[PDB]
Amino acid sequence: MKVIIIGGETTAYYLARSMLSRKYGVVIINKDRELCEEFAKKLKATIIHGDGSHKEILRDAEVSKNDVVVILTPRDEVNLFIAQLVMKDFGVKRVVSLVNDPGNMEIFKKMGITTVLNLTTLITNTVEALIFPDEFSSIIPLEQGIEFLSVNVEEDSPVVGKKLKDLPLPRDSIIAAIVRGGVLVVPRGDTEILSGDKLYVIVSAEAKETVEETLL
C-alpha cells in the first residue's frame, strides 16, 4: 500500500511531507514538470510527471488495488474522473478527493469517493463565525444529517446561570463539551453554564432550529 497523491501544487507537497513523516510510501503524480523537479529534490517520494487522468501515467505510477489515491486537483470534473478511473479500471478501493464546489460534494459521496471536508465551507463557517460571534456557528459537519455546531455564552444571555440538567434540549441534541477559558468541562447534570464560556453542540438537522432557539 502506497499513498498516491495525484497533483495539486503546494498542498500536494505538504501532504507528501506529512505522509512520508508518517512512514508511508508516497507516489506524487503531477503534470507540472517544473514542480515535479522541485518535489523530486525536496520530498523523498516517487515523482511521476504526467496527467493523472491518463491510464498510462497511472500504470507508470503502478496504482494498485490496495493503494490510497488522493486526488487534489482544483477541477472537480477532473477529480471525479481521475477517481472513477482509479476505482473502476485499477480497482482502488480507497480514494480521497478534494471537492471544490460545495455543491459537488453530493455526487462524490454518491459515487463512493470519500472526500475531505470542503475548504470553502470551512472558510465560510469560520468567516461567518467572526462576523457574528454570538450565534450558533457550525464547525465541521459529522455524518450526513448531523451537524456539529458551537455557541458562546453571552453575559446577557438566558442560558447563563442555568443547570445543564434544567436546560430543555430536544431529543436528538447533545451538549457535547463545555470549554471554560480554554479548559474542557465534562457536562454533568449539575453543570451550570457561565459567562464567557464556549459550549460545543452536536445536533441532527431535523432538530437544529429548536436547539438554537433554546440554547440562544
Binding site: Q84, D89, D101
Partner: protein, 131 residues
C-alpha cells in the same frame, strides 16, 4: 416531444441543438459563454443557460430532472464525463450521450452507462476506405 438538454453549444454542439429544435423537441443549451449561442439558428424555440457545466448550480439550472436526453458535448472529456455522471446518478436521466475525444476514455463512460460519440472511433471507419 423529447426534452433534450445539450451541454456545450460549440461546432459539433450547436449542430445537435439545431437538428433537435427543428425536429420540434424542447431544447436546453448550456454553455460556458454566451457568444457560443450565436451558432443557435434563427428558428430555435429552446432556452439557453449560460454557466459552467462543472458547477452544480448550473446542472440544477438546466432542469435535467425533466430531461429525456442529456448530451454532454463540450470540448473537455472530464467535463463531459462529469456532466454525464450528474445526469445519470444525480438527476437519473435515462439517456445520457457523451462526446468523448480520447478513445481510451470511452470505456469508463460506458462502464457508467453513458452512451458515447467518439470522433476518433467514427474516423477509423472513413480512414479504412483510404486503402
Amino acid at each position: 416531444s423529447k426534452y433534450i438538454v445539450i451541454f456545450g453549444c460549440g461546432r459539433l454542439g450547436s449542430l445537435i441543438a439545431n437538428l433537435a429544435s427543428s425536429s420540434g423537441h424542447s431544447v436546453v443549451v448550456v454553455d460556458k459563454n454566451e457568444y457560443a449561442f450565436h451558432r443557435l439558428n434563427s428558428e430555435f424555440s429552446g432556452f439557453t443557460v449560460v454557466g459552467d457545466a462543472a458547477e452544480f448550480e448550473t446542472l440544477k439550472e438546466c432542469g435535467m430532472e425533466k430531461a429525456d436526453m442529456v448530451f454532454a458535448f463540450t470540448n473537455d472529456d472530464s467535463t463531459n464525463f462529469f456532466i454525464s455522471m450528474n445526469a445519470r446518478y444525480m438527476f437519473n436521466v435515462e439517456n445520457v450521450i457523451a462526446r468523448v475525444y480520447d478513445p481510451e476514455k470511452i470505456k469508463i463512460f460506458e462502464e457508467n452507462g453513458i452512451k458515447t460519440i467518439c470522433p476518433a472511433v467514427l474516423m477509423i471507419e472513413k480512414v479504412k476506405e483510404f486503402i
